[PDB]
Amino acid sequence: SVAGRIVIDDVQPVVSNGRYPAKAVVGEVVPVAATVWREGHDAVAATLVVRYHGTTYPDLADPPQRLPMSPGHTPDVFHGHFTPDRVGLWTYRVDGWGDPIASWRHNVTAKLDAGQGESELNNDLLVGARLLERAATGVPRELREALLEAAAALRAPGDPFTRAGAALSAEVSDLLAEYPLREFVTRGEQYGVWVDRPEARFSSWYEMFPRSTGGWDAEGRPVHGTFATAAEALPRIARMGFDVVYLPPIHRKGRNNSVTAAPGDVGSPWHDAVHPQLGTIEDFDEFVASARDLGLEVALDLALQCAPDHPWAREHPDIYPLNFDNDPAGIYQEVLRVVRFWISHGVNIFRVDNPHTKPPNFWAWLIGQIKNENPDVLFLSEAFTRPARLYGLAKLGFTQSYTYFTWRTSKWELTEFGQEIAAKADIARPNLFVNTPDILHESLQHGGPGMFAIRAVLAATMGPAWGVYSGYELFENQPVRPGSEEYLNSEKYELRPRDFESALARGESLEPFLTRLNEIRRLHPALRELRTIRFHHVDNDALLAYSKFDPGTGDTVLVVVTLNPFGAEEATLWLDMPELGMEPYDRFWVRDEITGEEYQWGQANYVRLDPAKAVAHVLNMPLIPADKRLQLLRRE
Amino acid sequence: SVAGRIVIDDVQPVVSNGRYPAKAVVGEVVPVAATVWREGHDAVAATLVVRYHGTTYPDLADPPPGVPGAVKPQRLPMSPGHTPDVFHGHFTPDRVGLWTYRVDGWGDPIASWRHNVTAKLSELNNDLLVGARLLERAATGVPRELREALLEAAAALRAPGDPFTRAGAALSAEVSDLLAEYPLREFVTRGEQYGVWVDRPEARFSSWYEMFPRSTGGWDAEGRPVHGTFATAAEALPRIARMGFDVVYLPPIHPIGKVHRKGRNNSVTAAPGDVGSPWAIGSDEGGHDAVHPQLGTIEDFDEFVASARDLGLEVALDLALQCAPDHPWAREHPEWFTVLPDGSIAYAENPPKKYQDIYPLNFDNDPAGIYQEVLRVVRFWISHGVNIFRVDNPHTKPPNFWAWLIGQIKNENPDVLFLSEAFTRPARLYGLAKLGFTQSYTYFTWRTSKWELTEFGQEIAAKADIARPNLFVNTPDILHESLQHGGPGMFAIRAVLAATMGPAWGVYSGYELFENQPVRPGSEEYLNSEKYELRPRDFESALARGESLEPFLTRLNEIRRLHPALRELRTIRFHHVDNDALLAYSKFDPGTGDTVLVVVTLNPFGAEEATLWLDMPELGMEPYDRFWVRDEITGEEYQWGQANYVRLDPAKAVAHVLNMPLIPADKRLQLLRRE
Ligand SMILES: OC[C@H]1O[C@H](O[C@H]2[C@H](O)[C@@H](O)[C@@H](O)O[C@@H]2CO)[C@H](O)[C@@H](O)[C@@H]1O
C-alpha cells in the first residue's frame, strides 16, 4: 500500500502486512486486487508486475511480466491475476498510473458522436495528436507510423469524424494496448507467493497401518504385516482413487489404551530406523517404489517425542516430549538429519503430529531448511488447537492443516466452516479427514451407513484435500467407552486386519462410493479450487447446498446434500443465478454425477434426497463463461 | 505483525499495513490489540511499548523532484480477553506530536510455575527450587527497593523447613503485584513499530458555524442590503459564541474577480454591481494573500481574528486553489495553468458542476513553483492567526501535493488543522483522510433513513482510526430535500443527529431560521444563495418572533461541552428500537466513564412510541440491573432497565439525550476493546 501522484491501497493477497507469502499451487489462478486512485475526473489504470525468483524458500521466523488490471463494479478497485508455471517464490507488485489516452478517447468520442462541430472539437483533437506523438515515443521505431499518421491526421484540416478516424481506429487501439501511454507511474509494494506442486492443494489421502495388512492364519489369529503385505494392500487403495498413502510411525501401552501391556502386545506406533517386524530399510524402499508404480505417494508421521528408552534420552539429555530450549542447535540439527533421511528414502510428505506443542520458530526453520534443499517436500499440520495457532502455523509454512470439520455437524456450522475455509484460502490449505484413528465422531457412531456416506461427500467436495482412515469403508463406528471420541479395539494397540474384498462382494463396503467421489473430483477441476465455494439457499434445515468453479476451465459443480441419514428430505433450491455465471430468467441443463439424471433447471429448483437412494447430488453445472469467470473469482 | 519464538499478529491500530499513522488527539485513550501466541500450555504475555518522537510530522507521499520546503520509553501492560490469544492495551498521549506503539511478546515462566506448582492439591517436589531460581533471576529486574519481596520469597522456598507451603511466599499477592510491575520476561520478541499522530483536541471535538462576512452588513433604511466589513462581521460573532460554536468558518475573504464574474442565482453574466462568487479568488486588487477591499484591510482582519479569540472562537478560512481569469498568477505564472493548443486557459469544472468564473491550477508543469507559492500563502494566514483551513474539493488536486503541504505546515507548526470538503467516492474520501486531512466532510447529508443512519454511524466509528468526520447539517450548496419538506421538526432532528453522532458538527447560517426555499424544484441549491448576493439576516428578530432554532443549537452545544462521551467516536453503539422510523444509540468516555444515550424520531410530524432494547453490558451493566436516568432535554429522572418504553412527540421534543449511569472503571476498558 503506497502514496505518490497515484495512490495504491488495500492490495491483496497480502499476508500479515507482508510478513509471510501467500499460498499457491502450479496452475492456480491467483487473483490480485488493489484500490487505485488519483485526482479529478482524469483516467487511472494499473499494471500487475509478476516476477519469478526460483525455488529459494525464505526463512519466515527469527531462530518480468507486466499484466493488465481491469476495474470492477466496486469503484477505484482494479483486479488482476496470474497463473504461476513452476514451484517457487513469485512476486507480484501493483504499478499505478494515469491514462491520458483513455480519458481523451471518452471525453472526445462523447463530443464527436453525439455530435459537435470542428470548431468546438478542434482543441481536444490537437491534444489527442500531442498524446499519440507522446505515446509513439514508447513504441519501437518500426511500429510507430500508425500513431504518427493518426496524430498528423487529427491536426489536418476537416471534419471531426474524419480527423479522429485514424486515432480512434482498431490498428491504433491494439498498438496502444501493447505500448500504452502511462503517466506518473507509481510503483507499488512487492509481494510474495510461494507456489507449491498441485498435490499441496489437491490430494486424496488414505491412512493405513502396515502391521494390520497381515491377514489371519487358518486358525483365525491375525498375522503381523510387513512392508511386503502392505505393498500388496496398495492397489485397491490406488483403485479407490487415493493418491497419498499415509502411514502412522514406522519406527509400554497395551490393548485399548491400558497402562500395562500384556506379553506379546503390539504397542503404540507413536527415529531413522524401521520396525524389525515390518522389515528393513530396503523393504521400505521397495514399499515406496511399489506405491510410486501405482501412482501413489507415501506420507510418514513426523512425531517428535521419545519412548523413555529412546537412544536420545541416554545420549542427549508412554512418551517423553522433546525439549527445544536446553540445546537448541543440537535438536534442531538432529530433527533435520532425520527428516532428510526419509526424504532420501523417497518420502516427500510429512504429517507433523501436534506442532502447536513445539516452538513456532523451530517449524519455520525446519520447513525452510528442507524446502530450500528440496522444494517438493510437503508438510501437513495435525494441529487441533485454537484458531490463532492453527492458522498461525499455516502462515509459518505448513502446506496443509487439519480442521474443525469433525465437530461441524449442523447445516449452519457447515456453511460457517465452508465459508471460513474459502476466506482463509490464501493462508491455509485444509485437509478434511472424515475421522482419524484418534477421532470417531458421535454423528457416525449413531447415524450408521448413511452418515458415513454424507460425511464422505462433505469432505470430498468441500475439501480439495480430503482423507479416510483404513476401515471407514467398513463403517467402523463402535466407540470404546460411551461418549468417548476413541475407537473400540483401536488399530494403535492391536492388529486389526480387514477383509475388504469380502465386504465389497457381500455389499457391505463404502469402497465403491469413495471411488466415485474420487472419480468425480478427478474429472471436475472445480473441486480442486477453494476460494470459489458459494452456498445456495435450500429451504430445509436438513439440506445443504453449495457451488464451486474453476477460473481456468470454467467448470462448475453444485452439491445438494442431506444431513438426515434416515428419512428422505425435499425442499426448494434457490440459486444465486449470476454467481453461477447466469441471469435470473435463464434456464439450463444439469447432470447428476451420482444418479446420471438429467434435468432442465432455473433459479428456483425443487430438490429431493432419499438417503436410501443417495445422500447427495453432485450436479454438473453449465460451464462459466470466460468473461464472467474472472469477475466471479474477484476479491473486492 | 512478527514471527520468532513468540508470534505477534493482527495488531491494531494499523493503517494500510503501516504506510500512514493512526489518528489521535491529546487525552484520547487509544486502544491497542494484538494476537500473541507460543507453543504448548506454557504461559505467554505482552508489553505495550509507547515512545514519543516530538512534533516531527512525517511526509506520507513521494513528492516530485525539485520540490524543496524545509524519549523515556513507556512499557505498559497488556491483559488478555474473552477472545483467546488476544491481548489488549491502551495509552493516552499527553503531548501533541508523533507517538509510536510496539507490541513486545514474551514467555512468562513465573506464571507457568505458579500454575504448575498446583500440584499442591502434593510431595515430593523440588522444582520449588526452579521457582527460587526464577524469583532470584526476576529480582535482578526489580530496582534494589522493592526487590526484597522476591528475595524473601525465593529464600523461603529454598529453605528446607516444613511443607511445600514455604512456597506460599512465592505464590503470595505482594509478589504477584510486584512481578506485574517488573516481570521475568523470556524470549522477548519485539513487534512492529506503529505510528499515531496526536493532534490538539479541537481536531476531533469542535462545533463549527459557517458565516459570510459580506452578509453581516445589514440593510439601509430603504431595505437594500449593505456590504459588510470585518468590523460588522466582528459584531455578528457574540451570538455565534453564545450558541456554543468554537470554530467560525468563513468562505474566501479574498478579492473576487471582475472577469467572468458569476451573477445572482448562478447566472453566467453578472449585472453591474453584483457581488460575485467568493470562490473566484483574484482581481487587479489582489490574490490569495490579500483581503477583499470592501471587507477591509489585513489590519481589519487581524482585529477580526483577535475579536474571535476574545470570545473564545477560532477562525477557519477556506483554502480554494483556483483563480479568477484576472488573478495576479494568471498574468505572472501561466505555467501554473493548462494552456490549451489554441493558447487559452482551460475553464474549471467538476461534473455536473461547471465553474465559468474560475481557472483550475496546474500542479504538473512547474511543481516546485506552485508548491512553494501555496506554502507561502498558507504560512501567511497562519502568521495572521489562522490555524484552521477548510480545503476546497481536495480530490481535484494531486494527492502527493496535499501530503507535502500538510507535512510542510505541520513540521513548522503542528497545531494547524485541515478539513477536507471531499464529496467524492469513498476510496478517495478516506484516502485523503489517511493522507493527513484532520477532518472530512461526509455523506451525512443524504443519509436520511434509520437504516442509512445506522450504516453511517457504524461506518464512522469503524473508520475512526483513519478519519475524523465533520457533520454539517447544511452547506451553501447543500439544501437537502429532507429539510425542503420536513419543516422545523426536520431542522431540529438533523441538528440532534449531527451534534450527538459527530464529535465535529457544523451549521451554515440561516439554518436556525429554517430556510427551505430551493432554487429549482428538486435542486439541492438554495434560492437566492449567499454566494451570489448579500443575504443579511435579522437573527435577533426571528428569536423574538418565535422562529429561531438558535436556543436549541445552544442546548445541543451545552450538552456536548458537559458530556465527554460525545467527544469519542469509536464508542457509538446502536440499541435496537422496534419502530423503523426511530433511532437509538449510546456513547462513552474511556477515561471518565461518562455515558450518554440518544433516542431520536425521524418522523418530524407525528409522535412515535416504541420499546427500547438495551445491550446492557455495553452501558457497563448486567441484564437484570435497573438504573436511573436524567434527560438533558427535559431535566427530569426516569427508572430504566434492559427493556424500556419510549415516546417522542416532535411537537414537544424530537430527541431524548439521556445521562446514562457512569461506566465502572474496570468495565470501561473492556467496552473499548477491538477484538
Ligand atoms: O467560481 C467559484 C465557484 O464557487 C462556488 O463553488 C464552490 C462551492 O459552492 C463550495 O461548496 C466549495 O466548497 O467548492 C466550490 C469551489 O468552486 C459556486 O457554486 C460556483 O458556481 C462558482 O463558480
Residue numbers in the entry:
A (entry chain A): 0 to 62, 88 to 275, 282 to 300, 309 to 355, 378 to 696
B (entry chain B): 0 to 69, 86 to 136, 143 to 696
Paper passage:
In an attempt to obtain a maltosyl-GlgE intermediate state, GlgE was co-crystalized with maltose-1P. We could not observe the maltosyl-GlgE intermediate but instead we found maltose bound to only one of the active sites of the dimer. The fact that maltose was present instead of maltose-1P is most likely due to GlgE slowly degrading maltose-1P to maltose, since maltose-1P was free of maltose contamination and we confirmed its stability at different temperatures for long periods of time. Significant conformational changes were however visible in the structure especially in the S domain of the protomer with bound maltose. The S domain of this protomer exhibits conformational changes with several residues of α1 (V132–L136) and α2 (S146–150) losing their helical conformation. Moreover, all four helices comprising the S domain of the maltose-bound protomer were found to be shifted with a maximum distance of ~6.5 Å when compared to both the maltose co-crystallization and the apo structure. This brings domain S of the maltose containing protomer closer to loop 2 of domain B of the “apo” protomer. Unfortunately, the majority of domain B, including loop 2 and the antiparallel β-strand lid, is not seen clearly in the maltose-1P co-crystallization structure “apo-protomer” and thus it could not be modeled.
GlgE is a maltosyl transferase that transfers maltose from a maltose-1-phosphate (maltose-1P) donor to α-(1–4) glucan chains. GlgE is essential for M. tuberculosis and its depletion leads to pleiotropic stress effects and eventually cell death. GlgE is proposed to catalyse the transfer of maltosyl units to α-glucan chains through a double-displacement reaction in which an aspartate residue acts as a nucleophile forming an β-maltosyl-enzyme intermediate, while a glutamate residue is thought to protonate the phosphate and deprotonate the acceptor, acting like an acid/base catalytic residue16. Each of the protomers of M. thermoresistibile GlgE contains 5 domains and 2 inserts that have been described extensively in the first reported GlgE structure and therefore we will focus on the particular characteristics of M. thermoresistibile GlgE.
